[PDB]
Design an enzyme around this catalytic site. Sequence first.
Site, short mmCIF file in Angstrom:
data_model
loop_
_atom_site.label_atom_id
_atom_site.label_comp_id
_atom_site.label_asym_id
_atom_site.label_seq_id
_atom_site.Cartn_x
_atom_site.Cartn_y
_atom_site.Cartn_z
NE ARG A 3 -3.72 -2.19 2.55
CZ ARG A 3 -3.45 -3.47 2.73
NH1 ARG A 3 -2.21 -3.90 2.89
NH2 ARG A 3 -4.45 -4.34 2.75
CB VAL A 4 3.84 2.31 1.67
CG1 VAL A 4 4.62 3.60 1.88
CG2 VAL A 4 2.94 2.05 2.87
#
Lengths: 57, 125
Positions: free
Chosen positions: B113-114
């Site tokens: 997600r990053v």
Amino acid sequence: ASLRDIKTRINATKKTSQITKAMEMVSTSKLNRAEQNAKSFVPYMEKIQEVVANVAL
Amino acid sequence: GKHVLVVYDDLSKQAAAYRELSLLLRRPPGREAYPGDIFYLHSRLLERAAKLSDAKGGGSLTALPFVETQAGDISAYIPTNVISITDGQIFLQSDLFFSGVRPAINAGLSVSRVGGAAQIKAMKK
């Protein structure tokens, strides 16, 4: 194994089986017409053979 | 203000030890005989890893917890608990491992997600 894995495997096998059954049906259908086409063509070759067995001389 | 990388070599064994302690102390067992707060344990452990703003200094701490799955059954209690807490997941498969893929990262299931914001400009292209 896991219940989800077994159930998914069963469903995949079911769908493959149904598709193969449909394929068998369509193949038999195509045979049902190939056979009559061959039978209808037979007399033409019969005539050509009858003619050939005079031209030999 | 330093940067720290922390690796927990296995969290499943920690969960098993906590289960042993809770059963010996006679707490009521939940599913798979685990105590109720097994999620509260891992969550409050992992939540201490973060990046600090310049007000608190440029400190940062990243965590790489490890979870071992039985026969690849990800739907197990501990794997499902841990997978829903971290920011990303990397799935390693013996199937890919033996086929010749020496680092066995299943790229289809692995997510981050990053990602993108972390990669450099050249690599992002």
